[PDB]
Subunit: 163 residues, 6 copies
Amino acid sequence: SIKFELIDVPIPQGTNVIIGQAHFIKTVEDLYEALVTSVPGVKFGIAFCEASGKRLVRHEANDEELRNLAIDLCKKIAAGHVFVIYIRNAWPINVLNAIKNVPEVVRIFAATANPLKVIVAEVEPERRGVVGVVDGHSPLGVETEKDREERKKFLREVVKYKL
Amino acid sequence: IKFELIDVPIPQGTNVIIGQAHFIKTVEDLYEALVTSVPGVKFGIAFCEASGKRLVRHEANDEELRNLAIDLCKKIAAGHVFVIYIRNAWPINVLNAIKNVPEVVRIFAATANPLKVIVAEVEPERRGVVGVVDGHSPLGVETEKDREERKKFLREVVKYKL
Amino acid sequence: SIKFELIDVPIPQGTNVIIGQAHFIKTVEDLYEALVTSVPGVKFGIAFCEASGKRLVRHEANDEELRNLAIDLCKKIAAGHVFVIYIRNAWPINVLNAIKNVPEVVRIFAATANPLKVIVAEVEPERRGVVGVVDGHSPLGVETEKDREERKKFLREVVKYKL
Amino acid sequence: IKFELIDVPIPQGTNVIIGQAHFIKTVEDLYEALVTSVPGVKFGIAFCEASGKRLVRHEANDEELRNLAIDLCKKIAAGHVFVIYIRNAWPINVLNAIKNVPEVVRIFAATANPLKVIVAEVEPERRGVVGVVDGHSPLGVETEKDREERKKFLREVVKYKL
Amino acid sequence: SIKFELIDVPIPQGTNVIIGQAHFIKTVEDLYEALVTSVPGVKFGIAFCEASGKRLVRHEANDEELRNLAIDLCKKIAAGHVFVIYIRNAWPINVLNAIKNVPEVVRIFAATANPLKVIVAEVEPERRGVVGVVDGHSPLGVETEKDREERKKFLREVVKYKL
Amino acid sequence: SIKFELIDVPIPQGTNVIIGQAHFIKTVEDLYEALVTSVPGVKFGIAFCEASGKRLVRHEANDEELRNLAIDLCKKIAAGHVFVIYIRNAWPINVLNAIKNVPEVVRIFAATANPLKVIVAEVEPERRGVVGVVDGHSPLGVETEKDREERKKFLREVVKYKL
């Protein structure tokens, strides 16, 4: 019947992973383009699970370490049309909207640098799909006004994403 | 893997939007997306920081909605999930702005119907959203007469179509 | 999430299916427009599961075969606010971004022409939701440099989507 | 080529959005973009059909705004130009929806300031928009004190920023 | 000083022209892709005025008639970074949003099938820019409610873009 | 449109300029965010011409050289609601779509690193508007098949934006 599997996602320090679902072989080239045209010095690895035809994990990358991380995760998840992206020298917010707008892309399961698990369902031999993800940990509590003041300061004084 | 069901409270006049994002800036960006979408919108936004202090981060201009959002985040208890409750605005008035917030990657539901959130717990403190149960299953198929009434509703009551 | 069910998705040759989730009755009309204004001559069927009130499968089409395929799948999935689209004479990449931008639309579970299964969870009578999909098959291997050259040539000489 | 200046009337409480599109469906699509953006928005939309009957096409839920839009279209008298007047909503509440209407290709201005439209007439009945004069030229450069007041305004009066 | 020129734009029956402004040589390939991936049977010609380097009118097309129409208009307008697209078997609404979203594209001066003129300003030798366009003719009057009923019928019964 | 003026745009090597039109004071903060969250390490200066009230050139930056370049151009153009952006360590394609999506932004006149002129119309004292721009130079000829091969190789082997 329907079997559930958990896949642990390795995330080296300094990297972020983006996992999603698309369709059509052109996905690999369009994602490569979305990444390279978003940030000048981005280092990345992108792998896509072709679900028909030769059913090969298609890939592109300008960093071999990241290429292999992406390919390996695709092989472990082993679900049709799932794509994996590992990036360095760029954050997900720098490339996510471009990814969302790639016509082949239909879902983005996660964008994170936290411990992460992917829940996969296998229904028949070699027929798998992503049920969901476990991104990081559960909440320990609710932030206070002082906590709010602190995260506001972080965004304004450290990363300077807000004024 | 354990599966759990979470009932979602939805007071009359409100709509709930549940999704998944990342990064602490999510809460400020969602606040801005809502407030700049509709004059007088009333809302509550809560986001589950999944690392560090792991605190539910929130912004709001309505205390009732703020706490509803915080409560649901605590009940789902899944990292990077965000909850938005809104009044004086409909989801269609703000959804595209939300989709385009760079931190946002998923929107599980936008509704005013009875709603359940299905959560998977794979280990203590490690949970994720598997899906939602938005409303009820179909009772039948629209007839030509039904279609005409649907068209009339959109053109005469809400006037969203011509 | 009590009971899980597997729903097979019929896909006649020459057709593609797009399954997603939205809200509000206007969904059916907005998806109709998104489709007809994307490609001249597109043939399609679109059905949407109204989750409250009359709880009727709402549907628009310009092709009866596709209208019925869309309606039938909504009946089988039987989950509130899920929509189904079947298209001919157009590919998903020709219409997907328009669909993503429809304000009512919040999720797109799949866009494909491959063998497809929808995993549905039933928590109690008449209360169902989509857990995930199984789009195509798992990978048979990893793309080689030779495979890559052939994939590039396909996109440039056959479908001509790249230069 | 003759250049002409068109003064744009802007009643208190209203904002005008002027642009260029094509195809007759422009008017229905703009109507929908506005009405589904903000509950209770009041508006008038006029579009200059540039061929066929060459009639100014309009939609509106407010007669005052409808005629203001029609009048400006007649004064500019340039094919495919559209004019929108809105009340109970600000341009930022509806502009992205407008940008994404497939028929729309240009937006010359969105403002509540004194406004002039510069039109070029190259032959009888053949006119086009060359540009706009939105408000007035700068009087100086923002000081650090000025910046602080600007930030305070956005955070305390309109509350669009945190 | 500043000299104004008028350029008449030829538009054969059955075609539509899209004129705009972008930047960077990649514009020609990105526009080609936006067009071919939007509509299956689209026929088109796209030309772009490279404003530096070799300053060549760059082009792509799957129809020689349309290719030459695009190139010729670029040569007549002769303004840096202006692009011209001529399409058949597709309407501008089928491809405009994809064009707007191409990162290199910053302006779209016109999308039409009407008599059209482009106003160009020359400020120095070989330094030209687009001032504006004259799209079709001025209004003859204001539509009546009956006229409205008629255009509503056209969209619902003829082109079927509305319900 | 009484008087036309030509404004030269200084562009230091390594910088790109983006000139456009918006409305509302929040423009300055939204453009600041669009830039800083698009590329890590981007250096920029952004100035906006408030057209009413205090009528002050509003401006944000993380680089003084670029802040002053942006402020100076706004002073020269001197037209209500026009904004100017100068960037280093990032190319326009890395930030343009974010800018297009800022709700206050309604026009982008140019994005370039080429010799550039802004044509401004003054209808009366203190009332000015942008008529157009002269981005780079006119075409020297039409791309040959050989030129095309070289352009393709450039995009694939040098900047690597295509495969």
